[PDB]
DNA sequence: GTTATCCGCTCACAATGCCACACGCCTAACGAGCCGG
C-alpha cells in the first residue's frame, strides 16, 4: 500500500503534473496491456504507477520517448507487411 | 441508506432524493465551492456529468465499468439543454456558436 | 397517322444505335401476361339472370342483427358494471381511503 | 420671470445549507345520457 504522496511531488515538478503522468501511465498499464518495471504487491494500477513515478522510471519526456519509439516501430513494421505484401503478390 | 444505481426524474435526468425513493444524495452548491478550491479538475467532471444529467455517458460509463476498463465520456448535460428550451420559449435567441 | 407519342421519335432519333447494334442480333424478347393467373370463371351464367338478381340481391339483415345484438349485451353489462363500480356514497361520505404507497428499487442500467 | 439642483415618496430585490418524516393537490353550471312518467 501507499500513504504518502511528497516522495513523488519532489520528483516531478508540482502536485498537477503528477495527476496526469500517473493517470497516463496507469491507464496505458491497466488496458493496453504493458508489463511494469518494479514488481507488483498485490495492488491496483495507481499505487503502481505512483512508485514508479517516486522511484523515477517514469517520467513524462520518458512517456513521449517510449510512446514514439513504439509508434516508429509499429508503423515500420506495417511498413515491413506492406513490403511482405508486395512479395507475395510479384 | 445507500445507492449505486437507482431511479430518475421525469423533467431533468436528474436521481431522485430521500430514503424511500430510493434516491441520491444532494452534492449542492457548497461542495462543489470546495472542489473548485482545491486542484479537483476530473472529480467535479463526474459529480457534474457522469453521475447525472448525461444519458449516453452514464450508460457508456456503466458498461465500460463493467466491462472492466476505467474511462469516461464528457458528454454534455441534459438540464443545460432544458435551460435552453425554456429560455427559447421566452422571445430569446440564444444558440451555440461553432 | 398521327404517331405523336415522344418515345416513338426518341427511338427514331437513335435508329443509327439499333441500326449498329443489331448487326446480327434479334431485337426484342418483351414477355407478356399469360392466362394461367386469370380465373375465366365461365362455367355457367344461364340461371345467373339479371331479372332474378332484381328480385333476389345480396342480403346482410343477419349481419346488421347480430351486430346490434352484440352492441346492446355489451352496452347493458357494462352500464351495469359502470353503475355499481362508480356510485356516490350518501351523506356521510367516502367510508374508507387508499393509502397507497410506492417505494423505490435499486434498478441497473447496462 | 426661468433654470439647474435638492429633497421626499414609491417601489423592486434579497435574506444559509442539508436531511428525514407526515398529509394535501376544486366544482355551480354548460353540453350529453336514460328513459320515467
Same mark, same amino acid.
Given at each position: 500500500?501507499?500513504?504518502?504522496?511528497?516522495?513523488?511531488?519532489?520528483?516531478?515538478?508540482?502536485?498537477?503534473?503528477?495527476?496526469?503522468?500517473?493517470?497516463?501511465?496507469?491507464?496505458?498499464?491497466?488496458?493496453?496491456?504493458?508489463?511494469?518495471?518494479?514488481?507488483?504487491?498485490?495492488?491496483?494500477?495507481?499505487?503502481?504507477?505512483?512508485?514508479?513515478?517516486?522511484?523515477?522510471?517514469?517520467?513524462?519526456?520518458?512517456?513521449?520517448?517510449?510512446?514514439?519509439?513504439?509508434?516508429?516501430?509499429?508503423?515500420?513494421?506495417?511498413?515491413?507487411?506492406?513490403?511482405?505484401?508486395?512479395?507475395?503478390?510479384? | 441508506?445507500?445507492?449505486?444505481?437507482?431511479?430518475?426524474?421525469?423533467?431533468?435526468?436528474?436521481?431522485?432524493?430521500?430514503?424511500?425513493?430510493?434516491?441520491?444524495?444532494?452534492?449542492? =452548491?457548497?461542495?462543489?465551492?470546495?472542489?473548485?478550491?482545491?486542484?479537483?479538475?476530473?472529480?467535479?467532471?463526474?459529480?457534474?456529468?457522469?453521475?447525472?444529467?448525461?444519458?449516453?455517458? /452514464?450508460?457508456?460509463?456503466?458498461?465500460?465499468?463493467?466491462?472492466?476498463?476505467?474511462?469516461?465520456?464528457?458528454?454534455?448535460? =441534459?438540464?443545460?439543454?432544458?435551460?435552453?428550451? =425554456?429560455? /427559447?420559449?421566452?422571445?430569446?435567441?440564444? =444558440?451555440?456558436?461553432? | 397517322?398521327?404517331?405523336?407519342?415522344?418515345?416513338?421519335?426518341?427511338? @427514331?432519333?437513335?435508329? @443509327?444505335?439499333?441500326?449498329?447494334?443489331?448487326?446480327?442480333?434479334?431485337?426484342?424478347?418483351?414477355?407478356?401476361?399469360?392466362?394461367?393467373?386469370?380465373?375465366?370463371?365461365?362455367?355457367?351464367?344461364?340461371?345467373?339472370?339479371?331479372?332474378?338478381?332484381?328480385?333476389?340481391?345480396?342480403?346482410?339483415?343477419?349481419?346488421? @342483427? +347480430?351486430? !346490434?345484438?352484440?352492441?346492446?349485451?355489451?352496452?347493458?353489462?357494462?352500464? !351495469?358494471?359502470?353503475?355499481?363500480? +362508480?356510485? !356516490?356514497?350518501?351523506?356521510?361520505?367516502?367510508?374508507?381511503?387508499?393509502?397507497?404507497?410506492?417505494?423505490?428499487?435499486?434498478?441497473?442500467?447496462?
Amino acid at each position: 500500500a501507499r500513504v504518502t504522496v511528497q516522495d513523488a511531488v519532489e520528483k516531478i515538478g508540482n502536485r498537477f503534473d503528477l495527476v496526469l503522468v500517473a493517470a497516463r501511465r496507469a491507464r496505458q498499464m491497466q488496458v493496453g496491456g504493458k508489463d511494469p518495471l518494479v514488481p507488483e504487491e498485490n495492488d491496483k494500477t495507481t499505487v503502481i504507477a505512483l512508485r514508479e513515478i517516486e522511484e523515477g522510471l517514469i517520467n513524462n519526456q520518458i512517456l513521449d520517448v517510449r510512446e514514439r519509439q513504439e509508434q516508429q516501430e509499429q508503423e515500420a513494421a506495417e511498413l515491413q507487411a506492406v513490403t511482405a505484401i508486395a512479395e507475395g503478390r510479384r | 441508506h445507500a445507492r449505486s444505481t437507482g431511479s430518475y426524474s421525469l423533467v431533468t435526468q436528474q436521481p431522485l432524493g430521500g430514503k424511500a425513493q430510493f434516491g441520491g444524495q444532494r452534492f449542492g =452548491e457548497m461542495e462543489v465551492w470546495a472542489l473548485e478550491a482545491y486542484g479537483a479538475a476530473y472529480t467535479l467532471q463526474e459529480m457534474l456529468t457522469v453521475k447525472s444529467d448525461d444519458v449516453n455517458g /452514464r450508460t457508456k460509463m456503466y458498461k465500460n465499468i463493467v466491462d472492466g476498463n476505467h474511462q469516461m465520456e464528457p458528454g454534455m448535460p =441534459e438540464s443545460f439543454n432544458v435551460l435552453l428550451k =425554456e429560455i /427559447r420559449s421566452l422571445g430569446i435567441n440564444i =444558440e451555440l456558436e461553432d | 397517322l398521327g404517331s405523336m407519342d415522344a418515345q416513338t421519335r426518341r427511338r @427514331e432519333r437513335r435508329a @443509327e444505335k439499333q441500326a449498329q447494334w443489331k448487326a446480327a442480333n434479334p431485337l426484342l424478347v418483351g414477355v407478356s401476361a399469360k392466362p394461367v393467373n386469370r380465373p375465366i370463371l365461365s362455367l355457367n351464367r344461364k340461371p345467373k339472370s339479371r331479372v332474378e338478381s332484381a328480385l333476389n340481391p345480396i342480403d346482410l339483415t343477419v349481419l346488421a @342483427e +347480430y351486430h !346490434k345484438q352484440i352492441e346492446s349485451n355489451l352496452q347493458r353489462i357494462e352500464r !351495469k358494471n359502470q353503475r355499481t363500480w +362508480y356510485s !356516490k356514497p350518501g351523506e356521510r361520505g367516502i367510508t374508507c381511503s387508499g393509502r397507497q404507497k410506492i417505494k423505490g428499487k435499486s434498478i441497473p442500467l447496462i
